[PDB]
């Protein structure tokens, strides 16, 4: 993915005001509830019976930070995403076997948490900048399939 | 399909949207042509410039149609009959473009109504816009 | 949804399938576990060996359920009510696995009934198995 | 994609008895009719109003051979698919802009034409061998997106 400067600016600058603890937890929480077949993968997180139980679940709310932290790592080495996720490819492909569609779903959702959080500051071109990043990150996980 | 509580949610936002649905209609459309420029192909006849009255006009019509579907929410199919044919027989819009459109509307309602867009409502409005998407493509399947 | 002519087709094959639907049920299942081995995850409790009576038994049940849905084809939803919940609330099967399953059934009916599987019937049986797929996942959307 | 020998055998050997003129035409015809939004892309082929008009349309029936011929080319350099389609990537991505889902659809359909054609000789492991090939070919077209 040939990156633009304004895109890197847009990504790094909006990444600035991101509180990964919340965003990450909310992002996962939304993945868990909107696409509830994703909860299958977090049977080890315990209580996910209710939307209410999911959205304060320490493990969700803790894991959520983990995954977003990881997004951050992409924001640093934007030109080197292929390898930032290389290993978490094997994790998600060989061990866990998550269908790559989920990576967009969880990436589409991320775009919404960002949008609710930064309101008009999330302009359509910003949205587009983040759309690529997310799309890039999901290939980078997927990379170890075909 | 839609739950009786789904509909509570679906309708709620659309009121909390209200007449504002002219501007949201455009904002979503523009967000589609920016975040997904391969969508521009379908409107070669349009000036796809920011603010361009074409995308603004087309905007109203789009939301207005959603407005109308979430009112006849027990019968979305018949509420969007005339559009189902246009979007499949003349236009042949790829099913996947509908995913994108809905996505940008959710982004739009999030930016403007984040303290309404709770996961439960996130779900409902997806499920709505999934079945809005489905009936517009009924001539495929 | 299903057209009145779709249904002509859908039913037709299933008769031209007939009681053979025990063996087709397995053949499709095995084709899923071979061509899509990431599906094996859902049956860790099974011996997923070729011919294994488990996959054969499970086979009948699967086709049998389709058999039953293409009979109550005006009301597939209620014909597959009890399965919709199992496949979404206990099992949580990813929506995309349903795409795969249908695909292998079409491969199965093609191999065995190619002089029936004409594009028009290809369409109809997809459209059928799409709405069989949909109602089994109703607790998602 | 790390290829197996039996897979190469299976692919090349079933590719043996393929009549690309028919299979190719039938394969496209089925793409045109089962997923009719694909006909948008072949407005230059003229009459595609009816299933009957599509399934003998010289351009469909001619183009169908073209595309399958191309599949053949993959069957030759199986280890070098990345570059066999490199250019037809730009064709399908920059010029035509076809959503990559279609490449699976047209690839899923291919698997069915093959199945109707070679009957029991199309064993589940063969089906799986061809499933990868098709999956590989669609990445190779897609490659020039993200
Ligand atoms: C799209 C971007 C995604 C990113 C960046 C991502 C990243 C990560 C990271 C960094 C970890 C932690 C590894 C560790 O702690 O050692 C992880 C764990 C995991 N991810 Fe993902 N992930 C993504 C999507 C998904 C999706 C869609 C699913 C399932 C539907 C999934 C399922 C898991 C599971 C099951 C774990 C292990 C949970 C545990 O440690 O108990 N992930 N992911
Ligand atoms: C929920 C989804 C959608 C809704 C509610 C919607 C609504 C509408 C409405 C109401 C019209 C009629 C406007 C008129 O009278 O000219 C229309 C036309 C149209 N829509 Fe959509 N639409 C949707 C999705 C899509 C998507 C995904 C595309 C992708 C390109 C698309 C492209 C068009 C085009 C090209 C026209 C014809 C406008 C013209 O050329 O003048 N629509 N849509
Ligand atoms: C048209 C699609 C499908 C039909 C008609 C179908 C049919 C059935 C039926 C009738 C049962 C009940 C068997 C019993 O009583 O134990 C069942 C159970 C089950 N199905 Fe499906 N199914 C479909 C799709 C799927 C898919 C895609 C998966 C993917 C893994 C799946 C996995 C299962 C599992 C794990 C069970 C429980 C069996 C057990 O653990 O004993 N099904 N299915
Ligand atoms: C999945 C495997 C596919 C392969 C291997 C493939 C291959 C090709 C080849 C070899 C050509 C001919 C280029 C030439 O003659 O110079 C071509 C043309 C074309 N393909 Fe594809 N294609 C695939 C899928 C698709 C899909 C899914 C679509 C649209 C939905 C599409 C749309 C086109 C169009 C519009 C042309 C140009 C038609 C023309 O020359 O008039 N292709 N393709």
**Token pair in block for residue C3:** 């057209």
CB B10 within 8 A of CB B125: yes
**Token pair in block for residue A60:** 């969700």
- Does D142 reach chain A within 8 Å, measured CB to CB? no
Quick one: D56 exposed, middle or buried, by C-beta within 10 A (0-12, 13-18, 19+)? exposed
Token look-up 């094996």 returns C40
DSSP class of C18: G
Residue D142: CB atoms within 10 Å: 21
- Cβ-Cβ contacts under 8 Å for C111 (sequence gap 6 or more): D115, D116, D119, D120, D122
**Token pair in block for residue A26:** 């909310």
Q: What separation, in Å, do the N-terminal and C-terminal C-alpha atoms of chain C show?
A: 17
Nearest-by-Cβ selection for D135 from A1, A135, A146: A146
Ligand 4 proximal residues by C-beta, below 6 Å: D 38, 41-42, 44, 66-67, 70-71, 88, 92, 96, 98, 102-103, 106-107, 137-138, 141
Phi then psi dihedrals of residue B4, to 5 deg: -65, -30
Q: Which domain holds residue D47?
A: 1-146
Residue B94: CB atoms within 10 Å: 24
DSSP class of D46: -
- Does B57 reach chain C within 8 Å, measured CB to CB? no
- Does D35 reach chain B within 8 Å, measured CB to CB? yes
Technique of determination: X-ray
CB C72 within 8 A of CB C78: yes
CB D13 within 8 A of CB D135: no
Of B73, B63, B68, residue with least CA distance to B2: B73
Q: Rounded distance, CA C80 to CA C94, Å?
A: 17
CATH code for the domain of D34: 1.10.490.10
3-state secondary structure of B17: helix
Enumerate the H helices of chain B as residue ranges: 4-17, 21-35, 53-69, 76-79, 81-85, 95-112, 119-135
Q: Rounded distance, CA C109 to CA C13, Å?
A: 8
Q: Rounded distance, CA A48 to CA A36, Å?
A: 10
Enumerate the H helices of C1-141 as residue ranges: 4-17, 21-35, 53-69, 76-79, 81-85, 95-112, 119-135
- Does B127 reach chain C within 8 Å, measured CB to CB? yes
CB C111 within 8 A of CB D123: no
- Which residues precede a break in chain C, with C-to-N distance above 2.5 Å? none
Q: Is B127 in contact with C141 (Cβ distance < 8 A)? A: yes
CB C6 within 8 A of CB C124: yes
> What b-and-e string marks burial along D98-135, b requiring 16 or more CB atoms within 10 Å of the CB?
bbbebbbbbbbbbbbbbbbbbeeebbbbbbbbbbbbbb
Contact residues, chain C, for D122 at CB < 8 Å: 107, 111
- Does A116 reach chain B within 8 Å, measured CB to CB? yes
- Does A42 reach chain C within 8 Å, measured CB to CB? no
Ligand 3 atom with the shortest distance to the CA of C133? 1
Ligand 3 proximal residues by C-beta, below 6 Å: C 39, 42-43, 45, 61-62, 65-66, 83, 91, 93, 97-98, 101, 132-133
**Token pair in block for residue D20:** 């690309």
Of B106, B111, B20, B29, residue with least CA distance to B62: B29
Q: Is A36 in contact with C139 (Cβ distance < 8 A)? A: yes
**Token pair in block for residue B117:** 């867009």
- Provide the domain count of chain A: 1
| Residue minimizing CA distance to atom 12 of ligand 3 | C61
Q: Rounded distance, CA A121 to CA B10, Å?
A: 26
**Token pair in block for residue D100:** 């990559």
**Token pair in block for residue A134:** 């997310």
Chain centroid to Cα A34, Å, comes to 15
Q: What separation, in Å, do the N-terminal and C-terminal C-alpha atoms of chain D show?
A: 18
Do the annotations mark residue A63 as ligand-binding? yes
Q: Rounded distance, CA B52 to CA B44, Å?
A: 14
Of B62, B65, B80, residue with least CA distance to B23: B62
3-state secondary structure of B86: helix
- Cβ-Cβ contacts under 8 Å for D112 (sequence gap 6 or more): C106, C107, C110, C117, C122, D30
Of A96, A95, A81, A102, residue with least CA distance to A28: A102
Q: Rounded distance, CA B122 to CA A31, Å?
A: 10
Q: Rounded distance, CA A33 to CA B125, Å?
A: 13
Counting one residue from chain A and one from chain C, the pairs whose CB atoms sit within 8 A come to: 24
Chain centroid to Cα B65, Å, comes to 8
DSSP class of C93: -
Chain centroid to Cα C111, Å, comes to 16
Q: Rounded distance, CA B76 to CA B128, Å?
A: 9
Q: Rounded distance, CA C7 to CA C70, Å?
A: 8
3-state secondary structure of D18: coil
DSSP class of A35: S
Of B67, B66, B84, B64, residue with least CA distance to B134: B84
DSSP class of C117: -
Nearest ligand to the CA of C32 is: 3
CB B130 within 8 A of CB C141: yes
3-state secondary structure of C38: helix
Q: How far is the CA of C51 from the centre of ligand 3 (A)?
A: 17
Ligand 4 atom with the shortest distance to the CA of D99? 30
Q: Rounded distance, CA D37 to CA D58, Å?
A: 20
Enumerate the H helices of chain A as residue ranges: 5-16, 20-34, 51-54, 58-76, 81-84, 86-90, 101-118, 124-142
- Which domains does chain C possess? 1-141 (1.10.490.10)
Half-sphere exposure of A62 (CA within 13 A, CB side): 5
Q: How far is the CA of D96 from the centre of ligand 2 (A)?
A: 21
Q: Rounded distance, CA C21 to CA C121, Å?
A: 18
Of B126, B119, B59, B124, residue with least CA distance to B99: B126
3-state secondary structure of C1: coil
CB C106 within 8 A of CB C126: yes
Q: Rounded distance, CA A39 to CA C91, Å?
A: 10
Note which residues in 5-34 of chain D have CB less than 8 A from chain B: none
Contact residues, chain B, for D35 at CB < 8 Å: 140
Of B35, B57, B36, B34, residue with least CA distance to B45: B57
> What b-and-e string marks burial along C20-50, b requiring 16 or more CB atoms within 10 Å of the CB?
ebbbbbbbbbbbbbbbbebbeebeeeeebee
- Cβ-Cβ contacts under 8 Å for A73 (sequence gap 6 or more): A84
């Amino acid at each position: 993915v040939h990156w633009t400067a304004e895109e890197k600016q847009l990504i790094t600058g909006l990444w600035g005001k991101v509180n990964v603890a919340e965003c990450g937890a909310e992002a996962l929480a939304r993945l868990l509830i909107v696409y509830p077949w994703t909860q299958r993968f977090f049977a080890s997180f315990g209580n996910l019976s209710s939307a209410t139980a999911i959205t304060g679940n320490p493990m969700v709310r803790a894991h959520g930070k983990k995954v977003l932290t990881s997004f951050g790592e992409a924001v640093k080495n934007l030109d080197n995403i292929k390898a930032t996720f290389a290993q978490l490819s094997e994790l998600h492909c060989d061990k866990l076997h998550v269908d790559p569609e989920n990576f967009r779903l969880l990436g589409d959702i991320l775009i919404i948490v960002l949008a609710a959080h930064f309101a008009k500051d999330f302009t359509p071109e910003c949205q587009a900048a983040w759309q690529k990043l997310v799309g890039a990150v999901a290939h980078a996980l997927a990379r170890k399939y075909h | 399909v839609l739950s009786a509580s789904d509909k509570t949610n679906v309708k709620g936002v659309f009121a909390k949207v209200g007449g504002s649905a002219e501007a949201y209609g455009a904002e979503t459309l523009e967000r589609m042509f920016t975040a997904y420029p391969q969508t521009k192909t379908y409107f070669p006849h349009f000036d796809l410039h920011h603010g361009s009255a074409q995308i603004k006009a087309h905007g109203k019509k789009v939301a207005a149609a959603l407005v109308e579907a979430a009112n006849h929410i027990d019968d979305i199919a018949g509420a969007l009959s005339k559009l189902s044919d246009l979007h499949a027989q003349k236009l042949r819009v790829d099913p996947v473009n509908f995913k994108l459109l809905g996505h940008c509307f959710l982004v739009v309602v999030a930016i403007h109504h984040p303290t309404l867009l709770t996961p439960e409502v996130h779900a409902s409005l997806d499920k709505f816009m999934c079945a809005v998407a489905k009936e517009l493509t009924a001539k495929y399947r």
